[PDB]
Each structure stands twice: as structure tokens, then as C-alpha cells.
Amino acid sequence: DRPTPLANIDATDVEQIYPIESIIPKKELQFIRVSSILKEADKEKKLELFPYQNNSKYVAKKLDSLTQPSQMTKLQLLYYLSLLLGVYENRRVNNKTKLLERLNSPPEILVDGILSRFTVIKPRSYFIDPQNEDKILCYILAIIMHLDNFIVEITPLAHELNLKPSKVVSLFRVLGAIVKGATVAQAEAFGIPKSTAASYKIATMKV
């Protein structure tokens, strides 16, 4: 129905607005295997294990922070983000066979899950309509909200995702995030000049 994951209307903490269950069904989770990524010492080899190889800037940046077994769930979300990004960047592909050729051997059930929930079957051959296209991006952005602890800098993210900054702003607003300039406090934390912090856009979720 909506391009966003199903919100928890009773949420009292930002973490609960978009529960993990809303982003990835519980049944699809045992199939996101991240132990090898966590154990692999070489960053190049870690990156090679991701389901989409078109050198995601976001994945490589975010990887450096996900090193402990307590962060396994976050690492599964990053793996899934990579797959969704692969489906989005290859949105013009209309069949499962060509799609798999553009991807780095993800478990087939995850691809099936994406095709059944983010595409329409042509009356097998499929179509990603304009709404399903934004749905893919909204789930990517809901993941980023979990991974960046509900405070996101628009400008580096737009660059990392190869998306127009105004599209990132617009989609974060569709997700219910507040998008405005950084406070002098946020400027100190983010290491951005205080005098123009108002022009540096930040997306935040609130309860």
C-alpha cells in the first residue's frame, strides 16, 4: 500500500517506529548470513561478500563500525541494504535470470522476497512501477535511520547513494523524518562550521 515499511503506531522510541520485522520478514532473516563478513579481516574481501558489487560508498563507510557480534543484526541490515540497492540500480531489468547476473549470488529466497513485495508480475517477467521504485528507496532509507542512529546528514548520503539531495530530503519526509539545518550543537558533533550549520541538512526521526 505505502512505499514505506509498516510503521509501529504505538512506538515510544525512534528504534521502534520501523521495527526490523517491518523491513525484513523474520523468515528471510536466517538467510542473511553475515558471520563470514564479521570474521573476514581484509576489508576488500569483506566487501566482496556483499550481494551487490557496484562499489557502494555507503556499505564501505558503514562497515568500519560493524565489527562486534552484538552488531550482527545491523550487519544483516547493511547486507540487505546492499541487495535492495542492487535491485534499485538495476530497476530496468524485467526478469529474475538477468537480475541474478547483475547480483553477487545472494540466497535466491531473498531475491524472491523482493520480487513478490517490490514488483508487479506481468500477466516470470516483472515490472517495478514508479511507486515500487520509491518503496525500494524508502526501505533503504529506513535501514540507514537504524544504522546512523536516527540522525542522518543528507549531503554525504546523497553522494554515497548517487541520489539527488532533494530526492533524499523528500523521501525522508515521506518516512516521517524532520529535515532541517544542523543546530550549533550538531555542528560541533559533526565537525561542520558553526556559521553556516543552517544550510547543512539533517534528517531526524522523533517520538
Following DSSP, what letter does each residue of 35-56 receive, concatenated? HHHHH---HHHHHHTSS--S--
Residue that the C-alpha cell 509501529 belongs to = 8
Q: How far apart are CA 79 and CA 106, in angstroms?
A: 10
Contacts of 98 (CB under 8 A, 6+ apart): none
Q: Is the dihedral of CA 194, 197, 202, 204 positive or negative?
A: positive
Q: How far apart are CA 11 and CA 30, in angstroms?
A: 26
187 φ/ψ angles, rounded to the nearest 5 degrees: -60, -40
Q: Give the closest residue to 64 by CA, choosing from 91, 86, 43, 87.
A: 43
Q: Give the closest residue to 66 by CA, choosing from 81, 83, 86.
A: 81
Report the number of distinct structural domains present in the chain: 1
Angle, helices 130-147/72-89, rounded to nearest 10 degrees: 150
Contact between 52 and 83 under an 8 Å Cβ cutoff? The reply is yes
Instruction: Identify the domain containing residue 174 by its residue range.
Output: 1-207
Q: How far apart are CA 47 and CA 44, in angstroms?
A: 5
Q: How far apart are CA 129 and CA 182, in angstroms?
A: 35
Q: How far apart are CA 28 and CA 183, in angstroms?
A: 39
CB 87: neighbour CB atoms within 10 A? Answer: 26
Contact between 74 and 66 under an 8 Å Cβ cutoff? The reply is yes
Q: How far apart are CA 199 and CA 182, in angstroms?
A: 8
Contact between 202 and 151 under an 8 Å Cβ cutoff? The reply is yes
